């Protein structure tokens, strides 16, 4: 629900699609790569779980 923010302080809510887009920026992949492939990325995650 809130990214890393509940670690540093208050839980700042953010949409999970946009949290994951932050996660992509962290690994040096531009966030449009998430948003343009979000359905594939979700399907890969659900299968891996």
């Amino acid at each position: 629900t809130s990214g890393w923010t509940f670690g540093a302080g208050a839980a700042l809510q953010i949409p999970f699609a946009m949290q994951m887009a932050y996660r992509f920026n962290g690994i040096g992949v531009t966030q449009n790569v998430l948003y343009e492939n979000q359905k594939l990325i979700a399907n890969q995650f659900n299968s891996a779980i």
Partner: peptide, 21 residues
């Protein structure tokens, strides 16, 4: 392709200069 995109203007700071010229 983007889920949940929203419509708005995006400002273009070259244009008013070139227009004023």
């Amino acid at each position: 392709v983007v889920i949940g995109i929203v419509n708005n203007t995006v400002y273009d700071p070259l244009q008013p200069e070139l227009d004023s010229f």
